[PDB]
Design a binder for this molecule. Sequence first.
Ligand SMILES: *[C@@H]1O[C@H](CO)[C@@H](O[C@@H]2O[C@H](CO)[C@@H](O[C@@H]3O[C@H](CO[C@H]4O[C@H](CO)[C@@H](O)[C@H](O)[C@@H]4O)[C@@H](O)[C@H](O)[C@@H]3O)[C@H](O)[C@H]2NC(C)=O)[C@H](O)[C@H]1NC(C)=O
Ligand SMILES: *[C@@H]1O[C@H](CO)[C@@H](O[C@@H]2O[C@H](CO)[C@@H](O[C@@H]3O[C@H](CO[C@H]4O[C@H](CO)[C@@H](O)[C@H](O)[C@@H]4O)[C@@H](O)[C@H](O)[C@@H]3O)[C@H](O)[C@H]2NC(C)=O)[C@H](O)[C@H]1NC(C)=O
Ligand SMILES: O=P(O)(O)OC[C@H]1O[C@@H](n2cnc3c2N=CNC[C@H]3O)C[C@@H]1O
Ligand SMILES: O=P(O)(O)OC[C@H]1O[C@@H](n2cnc3c2N=CNC[C@H]3O)C[C@@H]1O
Ligand SMILES: *[C@@H]1O[C@H](CO)[C@@H](O)[C@H](O)[C@H]1NC(C)=O
Ligand SMILES: *[C@@H]1O[C@H](CO)[C@@H](O)[C@H](O)[C@H]1NC(C)=O
Ligand SMILES: *[C@@H]1O[C@H](CO)[C@@H](O)[C@H](O)[C@H]1NC(C)=O
Ligand SMILES: *[C@@H]1O[C@H](CO)[C@@H](O)[C@H](O)[C@H]1NC(C)=O
Ligand SMILES: *[C@@H]1O[C@H](CO)[C@@H](O)[C@H](O)[C@H]1NC(C)=O
Ligand SMILES: *[C@@H]1O[C@H](CO)[C@@H](O)[C@H](O)[C@H]1NC(C)=O
Ligand SMILES: [Zn+2]
Ligand SMILES: [Zn+2]
Lengths: 494, 494
Amino acid sequence: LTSKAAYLLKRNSLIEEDASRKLGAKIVLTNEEKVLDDFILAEKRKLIDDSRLNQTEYMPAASFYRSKDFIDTTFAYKIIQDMPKGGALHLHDTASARIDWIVSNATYRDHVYMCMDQDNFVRLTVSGTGPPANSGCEWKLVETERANSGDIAAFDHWLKSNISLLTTDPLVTYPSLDKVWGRFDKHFSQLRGIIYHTPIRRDYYRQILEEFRSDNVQYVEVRSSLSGFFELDGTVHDAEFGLNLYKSVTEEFQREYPDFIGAKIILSGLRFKSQEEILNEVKIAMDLHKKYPDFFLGYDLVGQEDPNFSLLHYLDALLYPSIQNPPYRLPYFFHAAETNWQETEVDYNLADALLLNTTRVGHGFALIKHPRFTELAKENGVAVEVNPISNQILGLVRDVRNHALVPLIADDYPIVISSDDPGAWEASPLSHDFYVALMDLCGRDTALTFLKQLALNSIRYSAMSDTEKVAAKAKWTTQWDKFVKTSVEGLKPH
Amino acid sequence: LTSKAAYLLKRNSLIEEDASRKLGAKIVLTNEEKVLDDFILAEKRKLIDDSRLNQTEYMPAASFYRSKDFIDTTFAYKIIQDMPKGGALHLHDTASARIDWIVSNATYRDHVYMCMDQDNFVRLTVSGTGPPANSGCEWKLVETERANSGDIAAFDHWLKSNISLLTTDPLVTYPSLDKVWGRFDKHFSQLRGIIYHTPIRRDYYRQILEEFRSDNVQYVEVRSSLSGFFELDGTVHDAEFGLNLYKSVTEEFQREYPDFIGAKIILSGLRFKSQEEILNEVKIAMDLHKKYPDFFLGYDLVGQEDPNFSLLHYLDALLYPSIQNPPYRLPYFFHAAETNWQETEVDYNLADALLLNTTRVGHGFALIKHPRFTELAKENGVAVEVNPISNQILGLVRDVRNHALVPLIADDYPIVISSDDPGAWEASPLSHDFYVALMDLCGRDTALTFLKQLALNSIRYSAMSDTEKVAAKAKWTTQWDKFVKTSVEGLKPH
Ligand SMILES: *[C@@H]1O[C@H](CO)[C@@H](O[C@@H]2O[C@H](CO)[C@@H](O[C@@H]3O[C@H](CO[C@H]4O[C@H](CO)[C@@H](O)[C@H](O)[C@@H]4O)[C@@H](O)[C@H](O)[C@@H]3O)[C@H](O)[C@H]2NC(C)=O)[C@H](O)[C@H]1NC(C)=O
Ligand SMILES: *[C@@H]1O[C@H](CO)[C@@H](O[C@@H]2O[C@H](CO)[C@@H](O[C@@H]3O[C@H](CO[C@H]4O[C@H](CO)[C@@H](O)[C@H](O)[C@@H]4O)[C@@H](O)[C@H](O)[C@@H]3O)[C@H](O)[C@H]2NC(C)=O)[C@H](O)[C@H]1NC(C)=O
Ligand SMILES: O=P(O)(O)OC[C@H]1O[C@@H](n2cnc3c2N=CNC[C@H]3O)C[C@@H]1O
Ligand SMILES: O=P(O)(O)OC[C@H]1O[C@@H](n2cnc3c2N=CNC[C@H]3O)C[C@@H]1O
Ligand SMILES: *[C@@H]1O[C@H](CO)[C@@H](O)[C@H](O)[C@H]1NC(C)=O
Ligand SMILES: *[C@@H]1O[C@H](CO)[C@@H](O)[C@H](O)[C@H]1NC(C)=O
Ligand SMILES: *[C@@H]1O[C@H](CO)[C@@H](O)[C@H](O)[C@H]1NC(C)=O
Ligand SMILES: *[C@@H]1O[C@H](CO)[C@@H](O)[C@H](O)[C@H]1NC(C)=O
Ligand SMILES: *[C@@H]1O[C@H](CO)[C@@H](O)[C@H](O)[C@H]1NC(C)=O
Ligand SMILES: *[C@@H]1O[C@H](CO)[C@@H](O)[C@H](O)[C@H]1NC(C)=O
Ligand SMILES: [Zn+2]
Ligand SMILES: [Zn+2]
């Protein structure tokens, strides 16, 4: 043995020790799985080596506006499309389906009005008793404008363009945190008036289920405000009504597609409402969790985190369930530390989130900056929902390889991958975020064990009961074996 | 007590446990030091809270081209200028002094020629025996063109402008890794011909000591190729000549300024040379370390890391000292993992860097992505040299708050702060990098304990002997006490 050879053995041991601690390093692959892993690794290495050695841009790490088409022209992305990714655990209902369906289906119904608002954005609303009661905008019947356009396709494309966040590059058109959050909030107010109409809302939820199933996702946990669904006559429904609407649509979908696992609902409130309102919503969530223990999961506070209220500001509301006699455990799913800041109100939300026994943490972008918080969350088994494309578009990081959670992936932290609002910025339900995770959030030697671990984590860290987890894993295993067999036989020689 | 009061006690305990683990958390401040700490924290909190709550840009995290003037108009920057920061441990000699001195002093000497190359960049060289022998460029004598300008200040300002990296915003003008590294290499090649002329090189090194002393830095460790210094007659000197030139200038400076601590030299070679040449340089470094054991520190490899050779490619050279009989310990100061890549050749340099017993690691941007490497290096006491402004300008991260080493700082990792090439992009010797470290690399509750720990680390992790470290800390303690007492008397009422 040479002194050089002893050095090489020590280097091999050290590199093996470091690489054995990443997410999915304990996954064992079959020979067919290894066929798929080599297929994926080959294209990933081609891209990395071309970018590094030829000193050219690494497209998977660029802005989603610029890389989306490139991603759609790769073989690995088709592989990821076909892969059963398990469950999407972090979704917002009003942005989880295509704008395309809102344009081609919803704005063709009667009593749908459009207008151009003070900021030169299109607003859509439904009014059954004549034009909308807000005359500050000049409301037109959508059918009349579509007819007078002379080109229905051009009209529909302009409508989709005036609603989407991906019509231009957000990193160029809205190049600050404030500007992109302005565009994002404007999107939600553009669709508020039409997407809360009960028939449209029900059909939209069905569209969510269909699109996620067709993208080979079998389970979704959705955040929803759940109340305010309205009728043509002005009747406005409560949170229990929305919950049951979703529940029956879900049960119908399940009977129609036995391969599907299901869907569950988390109630969401807004980070800028009064404490009285948030306490009301917490009591409502208590009643909903009591009465629908198997469909309703818990409560969350959403909206932009930097300029709005902290969790500590709502402590009296969030502590209300626990001060009962006997105490009530209302599960929480807090968004926390979606921020670049350090030792401020926003990232110290993490402290509150762990002390309130949160089931999962959304984003957790500043978690890596808090060693004790990271240890405590790992000890408690608190998984982090990661939405890479979301974090890029909403101004947390430019290069996805700079994502704050990459080190935590490399040290086997419990995480899941999701798309926050895929419909708002035209991403596939889960395939685009999985491709970005594969290309940016792990290294040159990691392809399939990582993705398979993500799929497994989305079941293990779901809010399902243990019986439900066992059944869900069985359904997902059936699909995964089907996918492996089909992809290998389409790729390997006979 | 109350469920709310018990919650608040547990929250306080958890938050202070998290915060007690950061760099400098064990620093005890005197009352005067606390005056300065409150002064700095007040401005820092004003900026952070203004940016967060008024939803405006956080200037300290913007591109250095845009924030430098803003920094120069802050009170905290004056405090940081006056603070004795200890030692600058990571510098490159040809970019450690102002371009202004090259323009106003070096290009006023005889036999200095200028030309415009094919990419419209000015090249400066010295030729004593007639115009330069390269006919690919059309060389003009600098004195005549300066005379024909008619506005000497305008000519000299254009000359500095054609050389600096901060004349335009690098993040805009060279918006990729390849583009900015092309500009950086071009900068060094612009000055190659004039800065290796022996009289100019000696005076330039003297200027380095003067500028770093005036920025209240008492100790510098400089990386240098040390060879190739030439005379007007064509004579080219070896590495020992450069070493002794530097040594005599340093000793003269020390005699003239007893408050100064001193300077030491690390030999640097380029990451794209043959294994044979790098082995020669290792032999030269071995001889220099044997013969000048207190002025010469060791060896390093420099140049852009992504497209050039790995440390493993040079293993035979780098292992040569240890296979001697008896084995020779040649200290190493490797640049390592200055990269966004993961599980590639570039970041696995860290493994080799650690197995070669490196004293410190330059940049180490990918270290956090390797949990075992981070543990091993922390155990071995291997400090990481952090150069925030350099890492922003050379394309590793855009928002300084996303810098990969912020978490390691938050967990008390041994690190030092330096400026890589402060002269190339018009930064102060060390104050600007300290300001950025204060404003971006630590949280809202950290000002002075962090800076004081950085200063102490630059002595603890210097390559000085133990006796030298004791003397250096005494000298620095004198300066620090003077600085504190003077600043407090200038800020507090009588
Ligand atoms: C988050 O989760 C926490 C951990 O589950 C929750 O704290 C738990 O809250 C329950 C219900 O309020 C408490 O259970 C009660 O405990 C006491 C007896 O406990 C101790 O009593 C003495 C004092 O040390 C000691 O002699 C005993 O051996 C016990 O150690 C009784 O009053 C009740 O019968 C009841 O069982 C738990 O004590 C408490 N656990 C912890 C670890 O604090 C917390 O409420 C959750 N927070 C939120 C916001 O949901
Ligand atoms: C980086 O630093 C490392 C630690 O300082 C260096 O490794 C050291 O290398 C030296 C020189 O080759 C070794 O010293 C020799 O050691 C052996 C005896 O060592 C062991 O022998 C048996 C084997 O297990 C065991 O029973 C003994 O107890 C000893 O532990 C003898 O041949 C000589 O007397 C001589 O002292 C060190 O042992 C070795 N240290 C370690 C921890 O491995 C390394 O070479 C440096 N690398 C570079 C590139 O500079
Ligand atoms: O109309 P709704 O109340 O059903 O939803 C609309 C509201 O959702 C919020 N939201 C949706 N995706 C997210 C949200 N907030 C915080 N972090 C990022 C992301 O996770 C904001 C919007 O105003
Ligand atoms: O040898 P010279 O002094 O004539 O040229 C100086 C040479 O140093 C290298 N360098 C200078 N600053 C750095 C360098 N390398 C890599 N990381 C970033 C930074 O730390 C490249 C240059 O060509
Ligand atoms: C770099 O580009 C050339 C084409 O000019 C190609 O042959 C080569 O494979 C590329 N390098 C890598 C590592 O892909
Ligand atoms: C929209 O979809 C529903 C089913 O959800 C369908 O019945 C209806 O015909 C569609 N509407 C339009 C206008 O295409
Ligand atoms: C929306 O449409 C108006 C009118 O056509 C146009 O001027 C404007 O730029 C569009 N806005 C967006 C955000 O696409
Ligand atoms: C926001 O700006 C106003 C000036 O319009 C200033 O008075 C206020 O203090 C700022 N907010 C913060 C938190 O500094
Ligand atoms: C250098 O000067 C020329 C004109 O004198 C100008 O066109 C060129 O852009 C300048 N280059 C830089 C890098 O400043
Ligand atoms: C340049 O500076 C050196 C000392 O650093 C000094 O001796 C010399 O006179 C200066 N040269 C010019 C041309 O000003
Ligand atoms: Zn979300
Ligand atoms: Zn350097």
